[PDB]
Each structure stands twice: as structure tokens, then as C-alpha cells.
Design a protein around this ligand. Structure first.
Ligand SMILES: [Mg+2]
Ligand SMILES: [Mg+2]
Ligand SMILES: [Mg+2]
Ligand SMILES: [Mg+2]
Ligand SMILES: [Mg+2]
Ligand SMILES: [Mg+2]
Ligand SMILES: [Mg+2]
Ligand SMILES: [Mg+2]
Ligand SMILES: [Mg+2]
Ligand SMILES: [Mg+2]
Ligand SMILES: [Mg+2]
Ligand SMILES: [Mg+2]
Ligand SMILES: [Mg+2]
Ligand SMILES: [Mg+2]
Ligand SMILES: [Mg+2]
Ligand SMILES: [Mg+2]
Ligand SMILES: [Mg+2]
Lengths: 139, 252, 201, 190, 175, 109
RNA sequence: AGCUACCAUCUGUGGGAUUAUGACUGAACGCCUCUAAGUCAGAAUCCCGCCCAGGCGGAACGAUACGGCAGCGCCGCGGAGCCUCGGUUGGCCUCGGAUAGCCGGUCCCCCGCCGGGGUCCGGUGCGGAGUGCCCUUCGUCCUGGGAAACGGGGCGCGGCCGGAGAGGCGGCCGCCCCCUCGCCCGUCACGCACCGCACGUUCGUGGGGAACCUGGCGCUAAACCAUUCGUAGACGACCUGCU
RNA sequence: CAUAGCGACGUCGCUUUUUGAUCCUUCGAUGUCGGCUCUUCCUAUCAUUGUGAAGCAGAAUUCACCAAGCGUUGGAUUGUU
RNA sequence: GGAUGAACCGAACGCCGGGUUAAGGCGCCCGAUGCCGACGCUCAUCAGACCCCAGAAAAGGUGUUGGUUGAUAUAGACAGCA
């Protein structure tokens, strides 16, 4: 049933902690609770990290366990994890909630106006579709 | 310290609030469990205790000393003039119990039944149900009654018939009739509703409810005896003759 | 807040839910808990049944009618658990207890409303998966509750009606998605406005 | 200690196929269908081959108590496969010293009437579990045959009969009368 | 002795010079302590047991923290210790995985408290070594010596149970 | 046209277990459930608005039955986003569990 | 006559989860194992039923005050005012649930043109998202462009349907009367702009109690005492009767 | 044949139904034995229900488990317990 | 503060405002953990839960978790079957 595993090369998203919101690669495992973790292209130097703050993504890199940051960075740069990550629905969900949080008062006013118009048009078309579907005549 | 010798308790705690009954008629408190496979029937009746006598009969109990022997047995006569059905009540099961859903009364309620609704029938104008009986006759009222019966049919889980006794056929002083709800058992709700509707205003003899040589339950109120002491009330041991402040008491 | 907080008792742990509810009603909020027969208690069923039977044994020796009142319905059991966490012998605690309503099943006022869930009281997150637990409805039924069956039938009826409502809601959502697909050139001016500000990815 | 992984694989024959609905195993063979849900055990059930039909049971981060459930699930699934391929047949001999035990099989082998157990007038009526058929063997003298697909149900029915025929208030070392499960085997013996 | 996160100290001391030996020998110890004050106290505690030395009759010539020489490398630590139980004294050998020696020793203190109810004043660490994976004896440590190690996170418990405190959706566990 | 004040609940007075300092009150502001989120509300004016029987003068208006006790938020309380408030007169105990308005008036943004 | 006696006579009751215990399947521990996960049987015990009482707990139903100015009910938000109690300051109209898994969509088959299956397609740190959605308050006048125009507003009438667990609610039609305005972007000016200041902004035509006027549609009753009964009774209370 | 049933020499407990030890409450007073009456409670179960064991063939008995629902009497002597 | 309490723990006292602590605490009663606290141990059909302190021993357990010593084993362990 499981599809994402903790392994060597697994890319994890950091949910909370000092490095919250960044991507890291799992380099090694310590004692069932921690992992040697290195984000060389996401500005996270090699360090131990608990599995509770990790959320595994679908990206796995190919390097041997406990290899150096040079090889981890090469494997990260080849088949670029930054671009493939930013192209996921996960990353743009994060980005959308970030910009929604940073939205200002004028922006909220403009969003209210646009949402008003959009909702009115959509519900007018919904009523039209209902009225069209109401024309049923068949045994 | 423990009591010197063991003795069973005087009286039962199962009937403990030994108070005057809040009712005079004696209410059923439990009707027989209804199964739809049985035919539609009534589960109760109202009679009046006339008196006791004794009989003679030959016993048909094999293995007994009285097998094929004549014995006398005390019997009680309960006069049971036919009941008259005047109403139908539906109940609905809720997670808080059965609750009364709808009540429909027949047209032409007898005067003796109507006396039950009045404390002073002498001074009253006898106005009860006089505006209710009109909806049996006008069109809108008939439609309303049909709606009420449909709602009982599609919502009620148990129905009962309100039936009253006929005091005019009895030799007693009382003219005010007795009303009670008799649960209709044995069938689907629609079937028992149709049965009750066709029995509205009708007479139900005790033949149609009870049969020969069957075991029934009798619910009533015992004879009143007034304020009584512990020796008569609980049948405790009377204290010795030498007791100072009285011997018909409980010592401790 | 101002509205009535309606919580679903299914899947919740009794004491955790009661502590949350007690604090809420002491903060002046009005709380309605439904499906008190779906509440869980940690520990195996025999363990919890012995606990309630030990409660049943506590009666006033002189007059049990004066003594402790052992309520048998799951709603009343949960209500007494909350009363144990409120200061019910003061006016403030009595008003807080008045603000709380508890039901077995879901009555018609709340059967057509949205039900909140308290994660901090949910069994799925508060109990280890391998631990045993007990159901309040079964516990109540075996200590004297009389309306387990009728509540079950009424719950099944309510679930059928809710399924019909949900199917209508899903049909409306499909139709709205189709409408959004239909009007695209007439909507995309505002859709990009929403997108740039994060609403509607 | 928490073992990282404890896994065990069972092999499924060609004539039988196994479907998974979460932790509910449906085993469909020639002799019918069996179905059993293991939601009380937190395991990962997987089907692997499209040629040989391996079913693998995985437990991750288990302790001593819940590593014991992997082999239990595998044994239950193997018993289900055995039930839908060969079936379970329990043969019960009825032993007695003086009073012969009269066993009458009622409707479709679903009710068993024991009449003269130790010569008492009480009649024992044992209801077999659904899906289990009881019969009197035509080979030996005092022998019952219980045939079914679920080993749980067949063995529970046999135990119902065995515990129904129980001597009381006597030295059971001396009074050996009763019906006892003589042997447990399959049907068609393949 | 209480705790925190421990850190290794090299503590070197010696007796005071006396006109029976003008250059007394120097003794060095590894002390895992919360800070240098506790480190010096424990150094005196241990040299008083081993040699006939006392804090008043001697002095500490050095006390410096020992930084981990490879804190970026997972390694196996074997710890030999002795501790006082409720009914005697026992010698124990335990194994841990960590990046830092002081981290492993802190793990040992927590583990001894967790399993044997032993307190830090009972525990007496006598040797800490970095052992090879082929020399490990504890199966819990050994099960992580897999170059192809792979496992999921099966039952993720929700930890923000109060943000929000009330919600309409029940939390998801599978990820 | 709009609410313009944040909703708060008068939860109680500053207290030990068996002592009560009525001169300062504990407020639970809606939506503020951590101590580090309370920095916005420090120093903000707060009002306990109630109704009485006799009419009282309204500044910039006609006399009505509305009365108010003014105060202000002084500091955070605990880790869960509650705050302390000083009112000009100690809040009546009947107001526990009732609405306090945090007025946004002395704005620092 | 009444009361009364094992000193006469009659009546005394069902189910559920389970304890001890005996078992099933089955690992741990390639064997065994009543146990670990999962199952079965199981009792003067336990709980309930039957039975006794009936909550500062509810339900359904009946009748609801004159032969005289005399009371009452419903309808109108009908009006003008009183006295008294204050809270609140947008709404969410709902699948069932799983958690070692879920949600959504679509073709072939089955249950009488909708649901249930099996494919296939998607999403899953839930975005068909409660960390969400909806509504959104300055008001108007010129004045264009877009959404619409099969549109909106009716304390406007009449009919219908659904909802009983506490329905006290919700929806759909037919006729009529109005605005073509209200939603987005613009053009155009105006409104006490009350001269820095609080209790402002809503629910709300709030709840409760007396009273005045106003119209329409309706109703003309019981309870208690006294008297009587004696199935009752210390007294109250209770069962009864009275053209 | 140690342990069906027993248990020497030792040793660990529980109970407050015995008797002591103490003198904390009460000496401007808590009526002091026993019986009678009556209710309730405990279980360390005599009987009854369901059970396991035996040096349990049956019958009778003995040991133990869940268990206090129910019962545990009439008399001579003695103020007596 | 220890629920409660002459003596325990903190601290000794004029009437007040602000700040901070002690001992002790921070699910709710009840101020404060509504930390995305850390690592383990533990299932009790009489669980356990904080000085004084308000209840328990010897002896047991193939429940589980660590540890010590010894022994066997690819020259093939152990257990099952023969
Ligand atoms: Mg006795
Ligand atoms: Mg005398
Ligand atoms: Mg096997
Ligand atoms: Mg015998
Ligand atoms: Mg008699
Ligand atoms: Mg058992
Ligand atoms: Mg059973
Ligand atoms: Mg003295
Ligand atoms: Mg006196
Ligand atoms: Mg005195
Ligand atoms: Mg006295
Ligand atoms: Mg005992
Ligand atoms: Mg104190
Ligand atoms: Mg204490
Ligand atoms: Mg101070
Ligand atoms: Mg406390
Ligand atoms: Mg608090």
C-alpha cells in the first residue's frame, strides 16, 4: 500500500523546524528516528534530522549512502530537483497559500470584485444548464 | 455485631412505595409483545368484580392425587359488559421512548363516555367533542381525518384503541364510564388501523378478546385499609406483653 | 464564537472530548454534541464495563432515591462526564452546563447541519492502533440503556437521506465544473486575478 | 526492539485466485468463495505475480507481539486456499461403553440430534455453523463427517458436538463416553 | 549529576608538588558532563576513587571540551559502564548509533533511565569506543547496517491537533 | 458599516488557585492561539459594553441604555494567546464568558 | 355483614453481555500452544425485562367564560405610545466513513430512466481544500463598454410536494403588479465636508408585561367550595350522584 | 510417591471478630452485660448454582475456583456471651 | 504549595501599583505546555500516578524490555519428522 519510502536519495520536504519549507535529500539513517540529511542546492548543510519533520516527496536521487556533499549536489543538479519540484502541484499549492497570506488590503478588495463577477457568471451558467436539462421527454 | 439468629426479611422491597395508588382504574403498564404474524386482536378488557363463589369440577391432571376426582375451587365473577370503541391513538418510537403521535376520536361519543371528561357533569353544558364531531361531517374535516389516518399508517409503530365501559348496564351508583387504551396486536400497522377504523363506535364483547380456559393477568387496586401500624402492615413480630411504650412496634 | 458549535461524537474519546467541551462552555460558547453512542473510551470493553458497574454500586445505603443518579443513555453519560469537569455547584458552572446539549443519534435540528470534529479528542490520533477500546453505545446498552435498537434504525434512515442529499450535491458540483469549463474565455480575466493572489491554484 | 521489516509470502495455485480489498481477502476457488477481513492487524498485503500469484504480508516497525501476526495471517490465508481447493473434513468417532449414542441428522446436515448419550432422556440439538454440513458415514459404524470450506466453522461445529456430549459428576477418566474428533483432513485428497 | 545535552571534556589534573615528589604525575580523563564545573567535580570524583587524590591536595591543569572529530558521519558507539541497581551493582555494555560521542553518551543516560530506572549518579561510564559495524552485537544497532535500507512511515499521527482545534475534516494518516 | 473591533471573551481575573487579583483581567481573543501572535494586540484599547436600565449620556449622540467600561491590553498571558487587560474599574464578575471588544485604536502599523 | 388466619383459599415470570471453566483456529517459538491478533459454549452472580413509584421531564387530544356591552381567541406589523430584561455585531442547507489508506470522473454488466459492481482516468501533505467556501453596506446623477436579457423584487394571491427522532422547517408551480435598475470596468458631479476623538456598524419589526385606538373573522366554558357517595378515609386527599 | 490430601525445622504476611500495650478524645455524664426485636453490610462459602482436582468405578467424601442471590432452625440447663 | 491538615516544602507579615521568583505546578475543575517537546518502558477481568503521607512482604511468571556468564553450530546447529 505504501508508495513513498525512507531510503538513500529520497527527497523530503521539511514541514517545520529551523529549515521549514525547504527540500532535502536523505543521505543516511540513524536509529529509526533520525536521518543524515543534506540539501546542497537548497541551502541545508549536512546534519541529523528527525523523521517527524520530514514529508517524503516522489523524487529519489541515485548516490551511495554517506557519500560526500559533492556527489549529492551533482546528483541533485543532474535531473534538477528544483525545477521538477516547482512544477508539482504540491509546490504550487505552497506558493499559492504563500501569496494568499501575503495578499494586502487592496489586493483583497480586487480579489473580492473578481470573485464576485466570476461567481455570478458561473452560477448564471449553472442555472442555464439546469434549465436546459429540465427539458426531458422520453419513456 | 451480627444478629443472633438468621431470619428472612419481613415484607418485600419490590412493592416498596406503599402509598395509595395514584389511579383507581389500574393501568396495564405492559402490553403483550406484538408479532405481525398473528391475526389482529385486542389485548385487554375492563370488568367489574362482582363476587366470589365456588364450583365443582373433575380434574384431568395425570399423576396427581386428584386425577379423575371431583374438587371444589373458589372462583371470582367479573361482570364484563361489552366495551365500546371510541378512539384510536398512534404511538411512535423515539430514542426517548414511545410518544403519542396522533389521536382520532369517533363521531357520536356516548354520554356515559363523555362524563369521564367532566368532574361536575351536573353543572356542565356537556360541550365536550361538540366541535370535534363536526369535522367528521364537513368535507375539509374529512380530508383532515384521512390525512391523520395516513400519517398514523406511515409513521406509527403501535396503535391502541380507546374504549370505554357501559355503566348503564351495571347496577352500580356510578354512571361515569371508564376509558382505557387497549393495544391492538398481531398484524401490520395498516391492517390494525383498518381493523380499528371498522371497529369505531362498535361494541367489543369479552368473547372477542378472551377465550375459555386461558391464563390472563388481572390488574387492579387492592382493598384500602387505612393508616396501619408495622404489625399489620409488615407482619413483624409482636413485642412481649411486658413492653412499656407499646408492643405493636418494631423494637430497633 | 457566536454560532452553536455542533460536534459529532463518533470516533471521539470520552474524557478528551469532555475536557474540550467543558472549556468551551465555560468560555460562554454554546455546544451541541450528537451521536453520543459513537463515543469511544480507551481500554477494553470489559474494563470499562467494570468501571461503570462499580459506579452503579455506589448508591446511598439509607435512601437510593436520594443517592447518586446513574444515567444510562450515552448522551447522559457524556453529560455527566462534562459536569464532572465543570464547577456545577456555582452559578457560573450551572450556566456553562446549561449551554451544553447532548443527544443520542442526531435529531432533526442538527441532522441537516455540518458537524465539527475535535482532532485532539479523536481515537485515531490519540490511541495507538493496537490498543483496545470500548463503544459508549454498547456500554450503555449493557448497563441499562433501552433505546439502542430504535436509535440504530433512525440512524440508518438518516444516513439514507444524507446519501440522497450528498448525491444531489455531487451532481451540482459536476454541473458547476461543467459550467466553469463552458465559460472560459468569459471567466479567465478574473481567474488570473484569483491565481495571482493564490486563491484557486 | 522494533524490527524494521518482517515479511512472509504465500503461494497461490492456478485453480484459485485471491483478491484484496484493503485487508479483506477474498479467496475464490473451485469449491466456492471464502472471505475474511484482517482489519484488526496493521499489515500491508500485496499481490505480486501475474504468473504464480504470490501474496506477501509485510509488517513495518513491529515489536515482539505484532511480529507474531504475520505468520498468523499467512496461515489463515493458506487455510482459506486449502478450504476452497480441497475443503475441510472432520471425522468424529462416537465412543461409548454401554449406551449407544444415536445421532440423527436433520435438515441438510445443519442440525444434529444426540438421543441416548449415557442413556439419559434429554435430547441434544446441536446447530452447525452456516456453510458446514454434517452426515453419518456409510463406511464405519459410529462416525460423523463434517464437511465445509472454513476451517474455523468446521472445527467450531465439531467442538460444539464434542462439548455437547460431556459427562458430568463422574470420573471422566472412567466414563469415556462421548463424541470426539477422530481425524482432520480434506476432501478429494489432492 | 543532572543532565541536558552532554558534551565531552578532556580533564587533566595532578597532585600538588610536595617535597617528597616535586613533579607529580599528570592524569587525564574523559568526562561527559553538562558543563565544565560538573566536569571538574566528576574528575575529582573519579581520581579520588582511582588514585589517592583529593581536590584540596591536587589541582586541575586543563579542562577543555573535546569536539567531535567527525560529526557528519554516522557511527556505532559501544559504551562500557557500571551502575548501581536497587539490589547491587552491574557492568553493562550497550550500543548506540550517532554522529557525536557525547550524543551517544546522552542516549545512553536516557536509555538507562528509561529501561533500568537508573539515575545519572548511579551510572558510571568507564569506556566509550567507536566500533565497526562488523563488531556490533546489539540487533537494534545491527539492523541499520544495510546499504539498501528502505522503510516507509506507516501511521503518521497528527501533531497539530489544536491548529485548528475544531474542524470538519477528520485527519488523514496515510501519506 | 463594519465591526472594526476584534472579538474577545472575558475569561476571568488574574488568579492563583485560591487567590484572585480582580484589578486585572484575562482576555481570550478570537483567532489568537499562540503567545507570539499576541504582539499585535498589546496596548490596544478594549471595551466591555453592556446595557443597563437608566439612560446615560452618549458622547456624540443621544442618551441611551448603553454603558461601557474602558481598559487596555497590557501583556500576553501564558503560551496559548491569552492576554491581560487593565480596566478603569475592575470588570464585574457577571461578564465572565461575555464579549470584550478590542478596538484597534492605538495602532502601531 | 365487615374485618381477619398457612387456622381457609389464589398467584409468583423472560432475555443479554459475560465469570470460573472447557474449547476452535493460530502464531510467538519451521513443533506445540484456549491467546498474542481473532472466535465458541458458559452460570443461584451482573444488567435489563416482568413488577412498584413516576422529574422544577415531555406527548396527543377535548372544552375553552354574554342574553348581555362582555369577556376571549385568530388575523394586520395596523398605528401611536409606555413599563421591564438584556445579549449579539455576516452566513455555511447535512454523505457514509477509512486511517497498513482515501476522494473525484467515466465506458460494459445488473436491480426497476437512477443506484451497485468491474475496467479506465485523475488527485492524495487532502485545492471538488473548514489552513475552506459563499455573501459582501457609502448612496445617488450623467454616462459608455462587458455579464445578462430563457432576468430580478414581491411581509401579492391560489394550488402542490417533501420532511415525524424534537416534524414548528424547506422547496416547487399557476395568475397578477413592477423595474430592465441593481454584477464588473469606466465617464460624470453631488450629498452637512458637523472643522483629529468613545458607547459608531447588526440580529431587530428582539423578548416579556399592562394599556389606547383601529378593521375583519369567530367562541359563549370549566374548576373549586357546599351537598352526596363509601369501592376511600387521622385531616386533607380519593371513587361517586344531583329535571 | 515431597507437593491427591498433609507439612517438621525455619521464614514472610494479612485481620482487628480475642486479649494485651498506650492514655489521644470524653469526668459542668456519650446510660455500663446479656437477651428480645429489626435492618443492612463483609466473606476468610456451611448449604444451594456453574465449575476444576483426587489415593474420584458407583454412592459417599475431600481439596480448590467464580460466587454473599438465597437460607442457616425448634428445645433442656445456665443472667450469661 | 502538599485537595484537606498545629509541626512537612517555600517563605515569615505596615497600606498599595508594576516587575520577578521560591516550593509547587501548567487536560478540565483551576492561573499556566492549545510546545507539530526528545528518548524509551508499560496493558492491569483489584493498572499507575510525586517528601512527611495516609497502605504491603517473602516467593513466583515461557508477559515484555535490557544485561551477565557459559554452551552448540556450514567439519552443519535448536526444534520437528524418520
Ligand atoms: Mg449470618
Ligand atoms: Mg415495665
Ligand atoms: Mg502450520
Ligand atoms: Mg461420585
Ligand atoms: Mg395463609
Ligand atoms: Mg478463556
Ligand atoms: Mg458467546
Ligand atoms: Mg504522654
Ligand atoms: Mg445525656
Ligand atoms: Mg458533654
Ligand atoms: Mg446518647
Ligand atoms: Mg472468596
Ligand atoms: Mg496553604
Ligand atoms: Mg495529600
Ligand atoms: Mg505584586
Ligand atoms: Mg493543581
Ligand atoms: Mg486554564
Amino acid at each position: 500500500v505504501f508508495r513513498r519510502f525512507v531510503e538513500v536519495g529520497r527527497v523530503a520536504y521539511v514541514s517545520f523546524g529551523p529549515h521549514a519549507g525547504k527540500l532535502v535529500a536523505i543521505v543516511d539513517v540513524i536509529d529509526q528516528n533520525r536521518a543524515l540529511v543534506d540539501g546542497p542546492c537548497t541551502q541545508v548543510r549536512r546534519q541529523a534530522m528527525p523523521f517527524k519533520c520530514m514529508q517524503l516527496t516522489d523524487f529519489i536521487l541515485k548516490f551511495p549512502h554517506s557519500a560526500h556533499q559533492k556527489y549529492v549536489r551533482q546528483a541533485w543538479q543532474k535531473a534538477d530537483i528544483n525545477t521538477k519540484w516547482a512544477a508539482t502541484r504540491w509546490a504550487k499549492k505552497i506558493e499559492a497559500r504563500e501569496r494568499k497570506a501575503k495578499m494586502t488590503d487592496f489586493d483583497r478588495f480586487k480579489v473580492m470584485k473578481a470573485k464576485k463577477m466570476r461567481n455570478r457568471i458561473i452560477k448564471n451558467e449553472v442555472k442555464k444548464l439546469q434549465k436546459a436539462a429540465l427539458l426531458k421527454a422520453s419513456p | 455485631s451480627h444478629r443472633k439468629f438468621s431470619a428472612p426479611r419481613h415484607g418485600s422491597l419490590g412493592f416498596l412505595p406503599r402509598k395509595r395508588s395514584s389511579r383507581h382504574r389500574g393501568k396495564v403498564k405492559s402490553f403483550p409483545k406484538d408479532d405481525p404474524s398473528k391475526p389482529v386482536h385486542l389485548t385487554a378488557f375492563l370488568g367489574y368484580k362482582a363476587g366470589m363463589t365456588h364450583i365443582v369440577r373433575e380434574v384431568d391432571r395425570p399423576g396427581s392425587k386428584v386425577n379423575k376426582k371431583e374438587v371444589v375451587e373458589a372462583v371470582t365473577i367479573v361482570e364484563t359488559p361489552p366495551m365500546v370503541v371510541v378512539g384510536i391513538v398512534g404511538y411512535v418510537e423515539t430514542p426517548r421512548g414511545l410518544r403519542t403521535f396522533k389521536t382520532v376520536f369517533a363521531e357520536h361519543i356516548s354520554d356515559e363516555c363523555k362524563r369521564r371528561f367532566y368532574k361536575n357533569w351536573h353543572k356542565s353544558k356537556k360541550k365536550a367533542f361538540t366541535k370535534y364531531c363536526k369535522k367528521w361531517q364537513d368535507e375539509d374535516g374529512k380530508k383532515q381525518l384521512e390525512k391523520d389516518f395516513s400519517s398514523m399508517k406511515k409513521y406509527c409503530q403501535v396503535i391502541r384503541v380507546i374504549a370505554h365501559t357501559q355503566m348503564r348496564l351495571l347496577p352500580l351508583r356510578q354512571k361515569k364510564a371508564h376509558l382505557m387504551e387497549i393495544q391492538v396486536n398481531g398484524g401490520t400497522v395498516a391492517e390494525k388501523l383498518d381493523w380499528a377504523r371498522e371497529r369505531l363506535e362498535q361494541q367489543v364483547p369479552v368473547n372477542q378478546v378472551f377465550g375459555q380456559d386461558e391464563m390472563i393477568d388481572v390488574i387492579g387496586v387492592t382493598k384500602g385499609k387505612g393508616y396501619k401500624g408495622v404489625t399489620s402492615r409488615w407482619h413483624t413480630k409482636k413485642l412481649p406483653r411486658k413492653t412499656h411504650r407499646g408492643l405493636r412496634k418494631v423494637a430497633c | 464564537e457566536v454560532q452553536v458549535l455542533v460536534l459529532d461524537g463518533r470516533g471521539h474519546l470520552l474524557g478528551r472530548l469532555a475536557a474540550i467541551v467543558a472549556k468551551q462552555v465555560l468560555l460562554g460558547r454554546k455546544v451541541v454534541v450528537v451521536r453520543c453512542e459513537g463515543i469511544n473510551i480507551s481500554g477494553n470493553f470489559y474494563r470499562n464495563k467494570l468501571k461503570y458497574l462499580a459506579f452503579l454500586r455506589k448508591r446511598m445505603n439509607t435512601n437510593p432515591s436520594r443517592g447518586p443518579y446513574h444515567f444510562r443513555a450515552p448522551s447522559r453519560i457524556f453529560w455527566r462526564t462534562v459536569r464532572g469537569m465543570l464547577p456545577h455547584k456555582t452559578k457560573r458552572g450551572q450556566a456553562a452546563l446549561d449551554r451544553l446539549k447532548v443527544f443520542d443519534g442526531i435529531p432533526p435540528p442538527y441532522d441537516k447541519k455540518k458537524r465539527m470534529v475535535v482532532p485532539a479528542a479523536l481515537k485515531v490520533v490519540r490511541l495507538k492502533p493496537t490498543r483496545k477500546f470500548a463503544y459508549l453505545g454498547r456500554l450503555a446498552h449493557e448497563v441499562g440503556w433501552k433505546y439502542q435498537a430504535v436509535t440504530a434504525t433512525l440512524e440508518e434512515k438518516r444516513k439514507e437521506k444524507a446519501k440522497i442529499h450528498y448525491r444531489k450535491k455531487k451532481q451540482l458540483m459536476r454541473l458547476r465544473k461543467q459550467a466553469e469549463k463552458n465559460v472560459e474565455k468569459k471567466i479567465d480575466k478574473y481567474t488570473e486575478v484569483l491565481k495571482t493572489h493564490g486563491l484557486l491554484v | 526492539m522494533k524490527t524494521i521489516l518482517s515479511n512472509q509470502t504465500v503461494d497461490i495455485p492456478e485453480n484459485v485466485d485471491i483478491t484484496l480489498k484493503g485487508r479483506t481477502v477474498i479467496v475464490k476457488g473451485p469449491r466456492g468463495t471464502l472471505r475474511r477481513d484482517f482489519n484488526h492487524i496493521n499489515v500491508e498485503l500485496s499481490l505480486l505475480g501475474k504468473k504464480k500469484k504470490r501474496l506477501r504480508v509485510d509488517k513495518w516497525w513491529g515489536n515482539r507481539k505484532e511480529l507474531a501476526t504475520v505468520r498468523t495471517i499467512c496461515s489463515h490465508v493458506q487455510n482459506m486456499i486449502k478450504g476452497v481447493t480441497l475443503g475441510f473434513r472432520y471425522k468424529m468417532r462416537s465412543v461409548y461403553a454401554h449406551f449407544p449414542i444415536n445421532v440423527v441428522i436433520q435438515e441438510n446436515g445443519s442440525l444434529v440430534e444426540i438421543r441416548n448419550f449415557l442413556g439419559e432422556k434429554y435430547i441434544r440439538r446441536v446447530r452447525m455453523r452456516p456453510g458446514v454440513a454434517c452426515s453419518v458415514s456409510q463406511a464405519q459404524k459410529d462416525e460423523l463427517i463434517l464437511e465445509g470450506n472454513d476451517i474455523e466453522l468446521v472445527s467450531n461445529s465439531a467442538a460444539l458436538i464434542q462439548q455437547a456430549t460431556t459427562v458430568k459428576n463422574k470420573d471422566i477418566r472412567k466414563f469415556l463416553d462421548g463424541i470426539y474428533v477422530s481425524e482432520k483432513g480434506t476432501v478429494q485428497q489432492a | 549529576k543532572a543532565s541536558g545535552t552532554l558534551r565531552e571534556y578532556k580533564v587533566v589534573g595532578r597532585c600538588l608538588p610536595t617535597p617528597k615528589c616535586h613533579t607529580p604525575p599528570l592524569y587525564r580523563m574523559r568526562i561527559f558532563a553538562p558543563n565544565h564545573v560538573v566536569a571538574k567535580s566528576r574528575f575529582w570524583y573519579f581520581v579520588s576513587q582511582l588514585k589517592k587524590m583529593k581536590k584540596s591536595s591536587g589541582e586541575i591543569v586543563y579542562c577543555g571540551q573535546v569536539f567531535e572529530k567527525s560529526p557528519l558521519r554516522v557511527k556505532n558507539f559501544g559504551i562500557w559502564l557500571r551502575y548501581d541497581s536497587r539490589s547491587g551493582t552491574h557492568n553493562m555494555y550497550r550500543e548506540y548509533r550517532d554522529l557525536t560521542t557525547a550524543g551517544a553518551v546522552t542516549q545512553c543516560y536516557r536509555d538507562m533511565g528509561a529501561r533500568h530506572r537508573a539515575r545519572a549518579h548511579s551510572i558510571q561510564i568507564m569506556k566509550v569506543e567507536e566500533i565497526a559495524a562488523s563488531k556490533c552485537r546489539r540487533p537494534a544497532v545491527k539492523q541499520f547496517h544495510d546499504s539498501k535500507i528502505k522503510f516507509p512511515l506507516p501511521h503518521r499521527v497528527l501533531r497539530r491537533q489544536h491548529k485548528p482545534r475544531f474542524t470538519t475534516k477528520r485527519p488523514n494518516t496515510f501519506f | 458599516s463594519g465591526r472594526l473591533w476584534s472579538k474577545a471573551i472575558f475569561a476571568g481575573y488574574k488568579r492563583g488557585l485560591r487567590n484572585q487579583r480582580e484589578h486585572t483581567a484575562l482576555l481570550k481573543i478570537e483567532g489568537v492561539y499562540a503567545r507570539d501572535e499576541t504582539e499585535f494586540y498589546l496596548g490596544k484599547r478594549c471595551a466591555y459594553v453592556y446595557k443597563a436600565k437608566n439612560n446615560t449620556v452618549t458622547p456624540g449622540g443621544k442618551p441611551n441604555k448603553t454603558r461601557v467600561i474602558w481598559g487596555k491590553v497590557t501583556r500576553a498571558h501564558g503560551n496559548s494567546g491569552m492576554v491581560r487587560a487593565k480596566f478603569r474599574s475592575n470588570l464585574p464578575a457577571k461578564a465572565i464568558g461575555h464579549r470584550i471588544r478590542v478596538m484597534l485604536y492605538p495602532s502601531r502599523i
